Structures are given as structure tokens and as C-alpha cells.
């Protein structure tokens, strides 16, 4: 199937508490495989998935150097952002970056990403063309001008069409037992009387990977969008995810409700009832 590799940078300034912390986490799909934390006692790119551990020491040295250089770069970027927004050096600010690539089943680049936020707000994003930028504001427009001058989009594109997809392809192969295994949701409906008049039907999807799942309730075959409490898909901690969707149903009306589960691990969407 299709896959993604994403690196997520968080650079968090913390004036008075040392230099901005720089964290990178790398994911393939919903599998964290690498992390870097400048606050680690010995900051290094660290494997977080077994299949990345076979990458040689040159990989880890190069990736760690990337992250150390990035730590400095993103501290510089935080200073730059302070300037661009006329902000004091007293406040704590966050630069985030997500970049990486989606590949299709054939491993070819489906699309690239390189997007940045400042203080949780979109700042600048490489457009899907991997050639132009969307700057969120005039500060990001300064960045965009700099990056257009520096051909950053072209460099990104070369990475996204090359090393990004190539390394992701390798990771998918090395991690094929897990990265290329969808664990279907174990699904069930629980029944929780609220009162004499109402019961909660909670449709559970547990143990599924990847996280993407559609969990809906229908009443009489009609989607209960507004009447379904849908918890965020949440990590179980064993790589898998959980989600539930609950409906408050009148007592005795449980059979009017069907839970519908779409997940790539399910050959066909499941329909469950209490």
C-alpha cells in the first residue's frame, strides 16, 4: 500500500532555560523510527523501531549530524522568527517542521511535504509542486524570498523525489514485517446504560495499525455524525491504535444502531451491532 515518511522538528525556545530544545522524530506511517532530542544527555539520532537499527554507523552519524546541525539551524530560525514577528527574546516560541514524502505501493513519490509552523501556526509550506511556497504571512514571505533565492524548494524536491523515497523504500523493506502489516481493528460494541431512558453504545476499534480508521455509528442506516462521540484515535503503546465511537441511544433501540469500521486491515468495512 501507500506509505509516508515524515520528520517532525520541534524547536522550542525557552529563554532563561538554556538553548532552544530541538527534537526530531521520524515516522514511517504511524511508526516512530527515529528520534533526536538536543536535551538528551548525548544527543544522537536514536533508533525507535527495530528495522532502523540495521542502518550502519555511517547512517547514525550522518543523521545525528543532520540533527545537531538542525539544532543550531533551528535555534537560528527561532531568533529569525523573533525578528520577523518583532517578538522579544523573553518569550518561548516553537518552530515546527514536518517534511517527508508519501510513496505509493510501487514506492514512487506520491507527494512531498516540507511545512513549517511558528508557535503552532502554519508559517511556510512547500507546495505540492515541490517548487513553490505558501507563506502564511509577511514574515513567512521573508522566509519564502530567502528560500526562493536559495533554491530551497528545488533542494527539497531533490530530496523528496530522491533520498526521501529511497530511504522510505528501504525502511519499508527492512520493516516490511511491521510497516507493511496492517493490523485490523479488533472491534466490539459495549453497552453502558446511562439511565432508564438511554444507553451508550460504544463501538471499539482496538489493536489496529495504522492509525487511520473510520469509526461511525449509523441509526437506521443513517450516519450519526452529530450524535456520535468520536474519540481521537489513540496509541495503545504496542504500535497499535484504539478508537471508539459512542452513541447515546434510547433504551431498547440498540438494534437500530450499527457501528461501521473502515480500516486498511479490514478486507471489507465491518458492521457491528450491540
Amino acid at each position: 500500500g501507500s506509505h509516508s515518511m515524515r520528520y517532525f522538528y520541534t524547536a522550542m525556545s525557552r529563554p532563561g532555560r538554556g538553548e532552544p530544545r530541538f527534537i526530531t522524530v521520524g515516522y514511517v506511517d504511524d511508526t516512530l523510527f527515529v528520534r533526536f532530542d538536543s536535551d538528551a544527555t548525548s544527543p544522537r539520532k536514536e533508533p525507535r523501531a527495530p528495522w532502523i537499527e540495521q542502518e550502519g554507523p555511517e547512517y547514525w552519524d550522518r543523521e545525528t549530524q543532520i540533527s545537531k546541525t538542525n539544532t543550531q539551524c533551528y535555534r537560528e530560525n527561532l531568533r529569525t522568527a523573533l525578528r520577523y514577528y518583532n517578538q522579544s527574546e523573553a518569550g518561548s516560541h516553537i518552530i515546527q517542521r514536518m517534511y517527508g514524502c508519501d510513496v505509493g505501493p510501487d514506492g514512487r513519490l506520491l507527494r512531498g511535504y516540507d511545512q513549517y509552523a511558528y508557535d503552532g501556526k502554519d508559517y511556510i509550506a512547500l507546495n505540492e509542486d515541490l517548487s513553490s511556497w505558501t507563506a502564511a504571512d509577511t514574515a513567512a514571505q521573508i522566509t519564502q524570498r530567502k528560500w526562493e533565492a536559495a533554491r530551497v524548494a528545488e533542494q527539497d524536491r531533490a530530496y523528496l523525489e530522491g533520498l526521501c523515497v529511497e530511504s522510505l523504500r528501504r525502511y519499508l523493506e527492512n520493516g516490511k514485517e511491521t510497516l507493511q502489516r496492517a493490523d485490523p481493528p479488533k472491534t466490539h460494541v459495549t453497552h453502558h446504560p446511562i439511565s432508564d431512558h438511554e444507553v451508550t453504545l460504544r463501538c471499539w476499534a482496538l489493536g489496529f495499525y495504522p492509525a487511520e480508521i473510520t469509526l461511525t455509528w449509523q441509526r437506521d442506516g443513517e450516519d450519526q455524525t452529530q450524535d456520535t462521540e468520536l474519540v481521537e484515535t489513540r496509541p495503545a503503546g504496542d504500535r497499535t491504535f484504539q478508537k471508539w465511537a459512542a452513541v447515546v441511544v434510547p433504551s431498547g433501540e440498540e438494534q437500530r444502531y450499527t457501528c461501521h469500521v473502515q480500516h486498511e486491515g479490514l478486507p471489507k468495512p465491518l458492521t457491528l451491532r450491540w
Binding site: Y59, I66, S67, D114, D156, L163, C164
Partner: peptide, 6 residues
């Protein structure tokens, strides 16, 4: 693998 450019 990362793209270190920054």
C-alpha cells in the same frame, strides 16, 4: 533519512 539542509 533526513534532509539536513537548513
Amino acid at each position: 533519512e533526513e534532509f539536513g539542509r537548513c
